[PDB]
């Protein structure tokens, strides 16, 4: 039916969703199963591409209040002849900007979407080589960082053609720390990044073999083999982590980078596929995964912090893990704030998202939202999103997962 | 098809076949997921449902197709023909009630599902008898603090005009009163029901922890009030193992969580009064929402007594005071030898429970939105555990509150 209702059980506020009617592709759920906690549940032909392009162009001309206009009809005819003759088409600059903002606006799992309209779009579709990709990525990092006053941005490289000429950033984020598995089984650096670290070493990277080695960019242009580049260290803003009360916390030697910039996702606009589209914002404190690091040869940060807090770690019901996790997250927010590097705590981010979601229900007719990903990884129920019912559905333009490029790349 | 679920910490992959047996809907569609939405019989329809349940009962005792299986199917069929309903055998009631718990996708405590004490109250005819059955349930389940899981099942729905109902949401809850300004004396969750009890003749002590009276409805009659004997109500004063000032907050809670407003469905039959009880997970105990003074709740007051910076949210003072309150609850129950489980232990048990269920049953319906605890989610092992949610019967269902349906006599 046309209307779907969601309720906030703290405030009793009821919102009516009609935007779900524009949902495009399946969720994986059926009337008899829900896959809401499942992590994720050769190119387009001509006849596949015609309706996807028309739907995006219609949506674009509706958004600028020119629906059915002469320019709308002429744009549609242009796109159709272009697909008819070249099996693909090119977006105008305005449509590219529109589509990237709306892929962020449509990202159900993103709590930071109140900012969606302020995204800075860098058009890199004239790029032809990995050196040019490096240039574009350096400028993006410099612009987005802005000496700590972080600005959201995306850089969009050429779209996919036949599938054998893809542009790809092999990094999962533009800035991440290396991880090195030792022979004795322990891990030095970030354990999340051991596989990609091994790939870089294999491609020729000389690793410093420290705890916080910024990984090199591994960049692939036009389907060619990827090439390694070192980001200039002055472009990488970092924050040492200290605690406002625990003078010993700085002795852990922890730091983190300021700029979260995800680079392994695919951007889909009007049936066109931008397989290289790194996008960046600023952190929510809880995301910063400094928790997983190893302080010594056995204990991770959560254990090491609790040990220095003199907590009882023999019983789980002493809640020493919860107590230590709070102090770690206090330290993260204090350090970014003291250094004037943009960051948002989870109470502020979730209060903003509720305001955002309400505005979207009124002005747009709904807001696709993935509760499983929107609720913060700690203190869930004391944030306003916990008691908020949400509807999840897939609108396009969208950001999508894609397989890792080392699994598919045909080495030259 | 079979569906896989992955734990993203252990990389353990479980294969789910049980979802292929579910026949009730979840609310989702191919195009919209509603996993965060809270709430998404005639003679002709009854026998298929009953046969379905009878089939799975005799499949469970490894006597499918047996003589007794067929005779029982024949019996249930004739009985629906002549009477438009049927009665469960005691064996089937026990099996049904345990599997309603086994199938409750939102319950993290289901490792215990087969240790459920079932009290058959299907001979009850009056609210006085309901009171008797309920007192015996509370005394048995409390067991001087060594809590034991139990359910008491009252007669099933007949024509819908004669339901048995427990009007309380839990057997034991604290009253909550509307204050002249706008704050709340007692539990804010129970203001409406407290007012209902006062309208019905209850004399409110107007305290902070007034145990509510039982409001009991038999055979569709007007409900009647009863005072649970206070010696049957086990309570725990909340104190902190480090903060000597915590006991000065004067808080306490009751030991026994006994939910009484849900509906049990077995083989097409509906049991609208079926209070069931277990023991608490520490994070459930809603003492956080009380008021200490005339403006500040326990969370604000705790942070105040802790001398935290309450001006910015990024000081995370709420998160700090939340953990301490939860340490105090666990310390207090453990010190009085009242059964309680922490969210770390309970979610650990649930992952082991899922392993068991996939091995022996082919799956386990699980609602991630409700299984993950309301604090420290990602440092518990269920956060990174993919789950499949689906609806099996027997089941516990939500039902309307009786005061919205009842025509007073
Ligand atoms: C501006 C500040 C931003 C904040 C504070 C923020 C916050 C978040 C958080 C907390 C998550 C979940 C993280 C996790 O579960 O590990 C997330 C996911 C996501 N964000 Fe945002 N975000 C921001 C900006 C952006 C921008 C600029 C884009 C794209 C243009 C974006 C697109 C996404 C997407 C696609 C996901 C989901 C990824 C997936 O499904 O795997 N975000 N965001
Ligand atoms: C024995 C110890 C038990 C523990 C520790 C436990 C724990 C929990 C928790 C923490 C919740 C969610 C609470 C919330 O969201 O506030 C829950 C839900 C639930 N529990 Fe259990 N439980 C236990 C026993 C039982 C028993 C004995 C039954 C019934 C026979 C049961 C039936 C249910 C049901 C039906 C729900 C979901 C109700 C709904 O759909 O809203 N539980 N349980
Ligand atoms: C722009 C931005 C800002 C921010 N503050 N946070 C962000 C987090 C993600 C994100 C989070 C989780 C995730 O999936 C997990 C398996 C790590 C993915 C998939 N690459 C992306 C993506 C973009 C983010
Ligand atoms: C149910 C659920 C909810 C949520 N809100 N988030 C989740 C994040 C992960 C997840 C998956 C993979 C992964 O890492 C690599 C294997 C891709 C990480 C990061 N450790 C997290 C898995 C499940 C999640
Ligand atoms: C036997 C048992 C033990 C326990 N330790 N905990 C339990 C919690 C619920 C429960 C929790 C929430 C809930 O619904 C919320 C919307 C308030 C309902 C049904 N209303 C039941 C039900 C039974 C429980
Ligand atoms: C999305 C979600 C997840 C979860 N895990 N839990 C949730 C609990 C409530 C909820 C709703 C009503 C309510 O109160 C009565 C009106 C039933 C209470 C208890 N105060 C909780 C609402 C939403 C929840
Ligand atoms: Zn779903």
Swiss-Prot record, chain B:
Binding site for (6R)-L-erythro-5,6,7,8-tetrahydrobiopterin: 36, 369-370, 383
Residues the record lists as binding L-arginine: 170, 279-280, 284
Domain of life: Eukaryota
Tissue expression per record: Isoform 1 is ubiquitously expressed: detected in skeletal muscle and brain, also in testis, lung and kidney, and at low levels in heart, adrenal gland and retina. Not detected in the platelets. Isoform 3 is expressed only in testis. Isoform 4 is detected in testis, skeletal muscle, lung, and kidney, at low levels in the brain, but not in the heart and adrenal gland.
Positions contributing to heme b binding: 107, 398
Location(s) in or outside the cell: Cell membrane, Sarcolemma; Cell projection, Dendritic spine
Function in brief: Produces nitric oxide (NO) which is a messenger molecule with diverse functions throughout the body. In the brain and peripheral nervous system, NO displays many properties of a neurotransmitter. Probably has nitrosylase activity and mediates cysteine S-nitrosylation of cytoplasmic target proteins such SRR.
Domain remark in the UniProt entry: The PDZ domain participates in protein-protein interaction, and is responsible for targeting nNos to synaptic membranes. Mediates interaction with VAC14.
Similarity comment text for this entry: Belongs to the NOS family.
Subunit comment: Homodimer. Interacts with DLG4; the interaction possibly being prevented by the association between NOS1 and CAPON. Forms a ternary complex with CAPON and RASD1. Forms a ternary complex with CAPON and SYN1. Interacts with ZDHHC23. Interacts with NOSIP; which may impair its synaptic location. Interacts with HTR4. Interacts with SLC6A4. Interacts with VAC14. Interacts (via N-terminal domain) with DLG4 (via N-terminal tandem pair of PDZ domains). Interacts with SLC6A4.
Descriptive protein name: Nitric oxide synthase 1
Complete-protein stretch covered: 304 to 722 of 1434
